[PDB]
Point group: D3
């Protein structure tokens, strides 16, 4: 089974699973999010596949997809919206600031790799 | 509708809001589309992500993903990259920040359980 | 020596001191907090002893006691109360957020150890 | 109920309770930590009271007691010892750095209050 | 006085003073660092002024000078060097990561202000 | 080259350069901040030199100068002022809290070295 062990343990809406095998860097590049609930006719309320960029965006060889910062930017935008709205919380603000600091560190990774001419290459 | 992102250079994809504001004032559908293009003018990447919109117990809701799911995926990938040959301190700081975000997201869920407001449209 | 070198250096109310010997894990399991002041009769204004859990809560020869998360939860509650009251501060708020993040990491440790089924055993 | 809602939800050794009434600053100044487990004799295996300084130390009719930085310094010492011993973890390290940064902010509070000549007085 | 109350309280090499009057945004734009020790001559061993950009750089009547990210980038370079050398420490590491995160947030400000077309203007 | 590679890439007011050679502990002890702009006469609008303490302050052939805490205290004071003024921001607040945590870690280093009697000596 390829079920992710998550920090949340109670009242989970969905489970997440690794899909396929290990790829470049030792990571997976496909995930499925699927609901802990079934519809009236016995099917998943949610069954959602996320495919990540696998290989350089410049080869046609590559599995072209999303990058982790895209997912974090989506979460960042939603948390900002929630904080502007009626159901804001301190827990949200702490989550949002850590999300933004993670994105800034991912951008650090992009910029030092640009400086070293190694972005888009399989090099440490 | 296009997201202004923290990354400014060498961006692979663009992210856009889909639809209108919903419960809590947020959007519940997003599109990620590649900045690169194929021969016929079709995006090389065009993926929609739909979020839970309305309570999961209600059959009329838009059932979908929740943000901690996406953060757990990113967490798992960062752990795999740190165990692999292309690890970095930048990766490690990002991973710890993602994990602390997930910890605060769980604190929210648990607080809302404590106050008997989880799954309700209330602060 | 058994007197703790603390982060605070001036206007300390109390001193903290280790009691006994190193135990499981290389740590001490009993501490005393004693006042830096003495009463009219020449006695400590404060002399408090804290005994930690030492060995498995299941087996009877263990020294049964408190755990560190209990102490941080007390401090978290008091800081929350102070922030609601009239003598709140930014310094309090930073302290409380770090206390809660420490508690969340202690719970990460507990949840990692339940998942590995090592909780309550002398296993790294 | 005076029982504290804690961060950890599963496998709790002990329960923590506030004791007394709201005091200076809106906080409680006594807490009890009691075991979730039982002897054969019918009593709690753990039942420990922690009384905090309530009112200034110089005033003779105050409830002299511990302060929160004492408790976090104990936890800091134990965490350092665990990290130097055989059962270390990244979760311990993250908790320890947060505990030390909380102690650093508590000291900032003390030092700021000395600056403003309000340490030991009921004022912001 | 115009002397800064600093985090460091003991064994301080220098004092810092703000110079001039409060300017745009409510801040001071000139500072002096001077040694706590004097030479045989009687004058300070260190007396260093730092002027900050006051007014937009495009306007020639402005006081052109340094900006805060310059100073933090100097400190970041020095901490990186110390860590690569013989006298490294965990305290240095925590300081460096915080300096770098402060720089990332200063950059976030600049980029936000570019986004809103307010960079180099006297507005929030 | 001796150019500092900075976290900010866009709309930079100034460049920062190392001057001289590596010194004690592996770090540079002199830095120039110079404008990315020039006046009506082809001369830098800005050209500060910052010289750091190099060698123990209490010996006399040492180069006496500033220390990194001095620069962060300046930045801390300015950020506090900007946050009290009309052009405050969340980005400023995050930068300021990181600056202050950096300073408290610098002070941790100083007090640790005092306690070990290594402050002012070339020793790890
Ligand atoms: N243009 C562009 N902008 C970006 O922001 C970006 N982020 C990643 N990439 C590139 O996407 C492609 C897909 O990654 P893959 O898993 O195949 O290889 C990756 C992966 O195996 C590993 N890696 C280690 N840590 C990370 C990490 N944090 N994010 C991504 N990849 C990582 O290290 C390889 C090279 O990374 P980059 O050197 O950033 O180039 C990648 C690569 O060309 C980017 N390309
Ligand atoms: N069982 C369960 N476990 C979870 O982890 C979980 N996380 C979210 N939800 C529920 O999904 C549904 C879809 O959210 P919607 O946008 O309609 O309403 C949400 C949204 O408008 C707003 N909100 C504010 N901050 C957040 C946030 N951080 N995450 C999600 N929703 C948030 O506040 C409403 C109630 O939130 P919850 O009270 O968490 O219940 C939600 C809701 O029932 C969960 N349900
Ligand atoms: N049920 C339960 N819930 C908890 O939250 C909990 N926290 C600790 N314990 C158990 O209490 C007992 C007292 O600790 P001791 O010092 O004797 O051994 C400990 C100690 O030597 C070491 N250790 C390393 N890091 C830590 C740490 N952060 N907290 C406690 N103990 C730690 O590693 C041993 C086993 O740890 P756990 O595997 O958590 O079980 C402990 C232990 O059985 C708990 N038991
Ligand atoms: N000498 C000395 N060194 C210390 O480190 C210290 N820490 C606390 N105290 C003093 O202990 C006494 C007991 O606190 P009480 O709850 O009655 O009043 C407290 C309390 O109601 C409230 N308060 C707000 N935030 C905090 C906080 N973080 N810690 C303690 N008290 C706090 O604000 C009052 C004055 O605080 P201090 O001004 O720090 O003086 C206290 C007080 O004289 C100290 N005294
Ligand atoms: N090109 C460029 N790149 C930079 O990185 C940068 N950083 C600052 N500046 C500009 O320098 C000039 C000098 O600042 P002054 O104190 O007069 O006004 C400042 C000051 O009064 C206030 N302010 C609030 N927070 C800050 C802050 N964190 N840094 C600087 N100034 C700040 O808000 C005004 C406008 O700030 P910017 O809108 O960033 O433009 C400034 C201004 O034109 C920059 N210009
Ligand atoms: N009195 C006093 N109060 C201070 O706050 C302070 N901070 C630094 N110093 C002393 O200034 C002198 C100049 O530093 P130098 O680069 O030549 O040597 C330094 C430097 O080579 C290296 N070092 C490693 N990390 C750091 C660091 N974070 N800050 C400064 N120096 C550092 O380790 C040497 C000894 O450091 P200290 O042992 O703190 O003593 C220094 C030294 O005597 C101080 N002296």
């Amino acid at each position: 089974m390829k079920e992710l062990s998550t920090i949340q343990k109670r009242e989970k809406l969905n489970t997440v699973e690794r899909i396929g095998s290990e790829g470049p860097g030792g990571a997976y590049h496909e995930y499925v999010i699927k609901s802990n609930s079934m519809d009236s006719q016995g099917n998943y309320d949610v069954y959602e596949t996320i495919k990540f960029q696998k290989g350089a965006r410049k080869e046609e060889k590559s599995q072209h997809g999303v990058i982790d910062s895209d997912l974090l930017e989506i979460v960042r935008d939603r948390l900002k919206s929630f904080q502007a709205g009626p159901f804001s919380s301190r827990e949200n603000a702490c989550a949002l600031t850590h999300v933004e600091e993670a994105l800034m560190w991912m951008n650090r990774r992009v910029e030092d790799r640009i400086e070293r001419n190694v972005l888009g290459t399989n090099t440490k």
